[PDB]
Amino acid sequence: SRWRQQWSGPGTTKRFPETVLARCVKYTEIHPEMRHVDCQSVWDAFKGAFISKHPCDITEEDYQPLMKLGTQTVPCNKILLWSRIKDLAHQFTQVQRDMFTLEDTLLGYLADDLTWCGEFATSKINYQSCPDWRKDCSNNPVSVFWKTVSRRFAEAACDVVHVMLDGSRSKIFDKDSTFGSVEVHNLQPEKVQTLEAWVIHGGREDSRDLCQDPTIKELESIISKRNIQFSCKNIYRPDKFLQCVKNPE
Amino acid sequence: SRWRQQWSGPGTTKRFPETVLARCVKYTEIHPEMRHVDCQSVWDAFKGAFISKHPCDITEEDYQPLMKLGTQTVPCNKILLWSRIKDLAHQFTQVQRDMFTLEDTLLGYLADDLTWCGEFATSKINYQSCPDWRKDCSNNPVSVFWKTVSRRFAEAACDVVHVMLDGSRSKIFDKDSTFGSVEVHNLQPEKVQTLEAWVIHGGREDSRDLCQDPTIKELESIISKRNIQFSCKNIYRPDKFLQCVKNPED
Numbered sequence: 001s002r003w004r005q006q007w008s009g010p011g012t013t014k015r016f017p018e019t020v021l022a023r024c025v026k027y028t029e030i031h032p033e034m035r036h037v038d039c040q041s042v043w044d045a046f047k048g049a050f051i052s053k054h055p056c057d058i059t060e061e062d063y064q065p066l067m068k069l070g071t072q073t074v075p076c077n078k079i080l081l082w083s084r085i086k087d088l089a090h091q092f093t094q095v096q097r098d099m100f101t102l103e104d105t106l107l108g109y110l111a112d113d114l115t116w117c118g119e120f121a122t123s124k125i126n127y128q129s130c131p132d133w134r135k136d137c138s139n140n141p142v143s144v145f146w147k148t149v150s151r152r153f154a155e156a157a158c159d160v161v162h163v164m165l166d167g168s169r170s171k172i173f174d175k176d177s178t179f180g181s182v183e184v185h186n187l188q189p190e191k192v193q194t195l196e197a198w199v200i201h202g203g204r205e206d207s208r209d210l211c212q213d214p215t216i217k218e219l220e221s222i223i224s225k226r227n228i229q230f231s232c233k234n235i236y237r238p239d240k241f242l243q244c245v246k247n248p249e
Numbered sequence: 250s251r252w253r254q255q256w257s258g259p260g261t262t263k264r265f266p267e268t269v270l271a272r273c274v275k276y277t278e279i280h281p282e283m284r285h286v287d288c289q290s291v292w293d294a295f296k297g298a299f300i301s302k303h304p305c306d307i308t309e310e311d312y313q314p315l316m317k318l319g320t321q322t323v324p325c326n327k328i329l330l331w332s333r334i335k336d337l338a339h340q341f342t343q344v345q346r347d348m349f350t351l352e353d354t355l356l357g358y359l360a361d362d363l364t365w366c367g368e369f370a371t372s373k374i375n376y377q378s379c380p381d382w383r384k385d386c387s388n389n390p391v392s393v394f395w396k397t398v399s400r401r402f403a404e405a406a407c408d409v410v411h412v413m414l415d416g417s418r419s420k421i422f423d424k425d426s427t428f429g430s431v432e433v434h435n436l437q438p439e440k441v442q443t444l445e446a447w448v449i450h451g452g453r454e455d456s457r458d459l460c461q462d463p464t465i466k467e468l469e470s471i472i473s474k475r476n477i478q479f480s481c482k483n484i485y486r487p488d489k490f491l492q493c494v495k496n497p498e499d
């Protein structure tokens with residue numbers, strides 16, 4: 001288009017339509033309980049959320065048709081959130097398969113590690129650049145997608161909700177994250193009794209109780225205000241922790 | 250009441266209201282995903298289905314308020330049906346904890362092994378007798394309850410559905426059962442590809458292939474007409490079958 005401006009963020013992932021379609025087919029193959037899904041309809045609703053729209057004015061309503069088609073009931077008491085440490089959370093649920101991260105749902109599975117955006121009044125995907133959340137605009141197709149689906153995922157949790165936190169970083173709990181700014185504030189006190197944090201140890205620091213870290217105390221204060229209880233555990237040896245989850249015999 | 254007639258079936262189970270309430274509280278305690286349920290409302294809706302009503306004119310609509318409150322999503326590809334061998338089916342799911350029978354749902358859990366009925370125009374439970382489906386009337390509170398919940402359970406299944414059958418009896422498959430007259434006819438062909446039967450052997454079956462039994466062939470014909478595939482397997486050693494599910498390491 002002769003009106004299309006340059007953005008600071010990377011362009012849409014190459015082969016984005018074909019990648020989403022292939023993922024949808026693969027997911028329904030792996031999960032027989034979701035085989036009612038029509039993957040053509042899913043992609044059509046996904047594309048309809050952002051195609052032909054300015055990629056700085058996307059709203060939660062734009063994704064509502066996709067949200068409906070992707071409706072999925074995950075056992076509300078088996079939900080695992082994560083902050084910065086997505087790799088270990090997914091390895092965990094690959095072993096503890098009755099536990100689920102957002103990326104283990106259909107919608108999270110489709111979009112995991114992809115970027116996308118379009119342009120106003122055109123049917124073309126923008127493969128050259130997409131808005132950066134800081135330098136360009138906050139209401140872009142990718143950021144709006146994850147804050148919408150993340151909020152819905154947290155709203156469905158019940159009983160005890162677990163979150164993995166990255167203990168190798170200066171902000172073990174970071175307000176400037178999906179967990180800190182979306183998930184923690186949309187757990188429903190009527191349904192969730194406790195938020196249990198798993199602080200994953202790593203980095204080049206000598207072993208110490210990281211549940212005493214100031215940002216964890218910050219996290220405890222935040223969730224307590226919402227009338228939800230807080231629990232914290234250190235995962236000192238992640239490799240050994242996974243080994244115990246796999247073969248606790 | 251001065252109008253109440255005698256029925257041929259046993260009366261309502263003793264302590265029925267207390268038993269349903271206790272079971273509802275116990276179930277939601279064990280299953281956190283169902284704690285949105287208000288057990289008082291569940292009992293009230295259960296009670297409202299048959300109290301003050303003639304126990305020969307109960308309908309599926311009478312139980313709809315209970316059905317709505319009892320809504321529960323079980324993984325549709327992990328459903329286990331059974332015919333006459335209820336004990337082993339429950340022993341199986343207690344070990345294979347990702348599979349569910351109807352009695353592993355809240356609604357099935359409440360009513361398992363219980364009998365109940367009321368009377369028209371009165372608020373009293375009939376602890377003296379209840380209608381027998383054969384000698385008195387088929388549309389009684391118990392029979393109507395189970396045909397309703399069993400149909401919805403069967404309607405929810407998807408992919409591969411399993412049914413345990415009692416191979417120690419003459420009619421391994423019996424049309425005159427909840428499975429044979431309700432469940433098999435309400436599996437949705439759009440969602441279910443296969444019905445897999447597990448024929449449980451009894452006391453020394455000479456290792457005979459019971460999947461060739463005439464009643465099994467009858468089952469295969471019935472389900473095939475509905476455009477669903479059929480698979481059959483013999484469970485020769487029920488006790489050993491459970492231990493292998495307990496300890497697959499061997």
Ligand SMILES: NC(=O)c1ccc[n+]([C@@H]2O[C@H](CO)[C@@H](O)[C@H]2O)c1
Binds near residue numbers: 103114142178
């Ligand atoms: N699983 C994901 O890719 C994921 C989960 C939550 C938030 N995000 C955001 O989307 C972008 C594109 O992947 C990421 O950089 C996050 O900002 C992604």
Ligand SMILES: NC(=O)c1ccc[n+]([C@@H]2O[C@H](CO)[C@@H](O)[C@H]2O)c1
Binds near residue numbers: 352363
């Ligand atoms: N779980 C049960 O007890 C069950 C399951 C299906 C049908 N029924 C009927 O209810 C009566 C009272 O328990 C039984 O005799 C069956 O007819 C019971």
Ligand SMILES: *[C@H]1O[C@H](CO)[C@@H](O)[C@H]1O
Binds near residue numbers: 080081101146150179
């Ligand atoms: C917060 O938790 C989710 C994993 O369940 C992750 O995608 C982020 O949104």
Ligand SMILES: *[C@H]1O[C@H](CO)[C@@H](O)[C@H]1O
Binds near residue numbers: 329349351
């Ligand atoms: C048929 O299957 C059910 C077990 O899932 C049993 O209750 C009968 O209705």
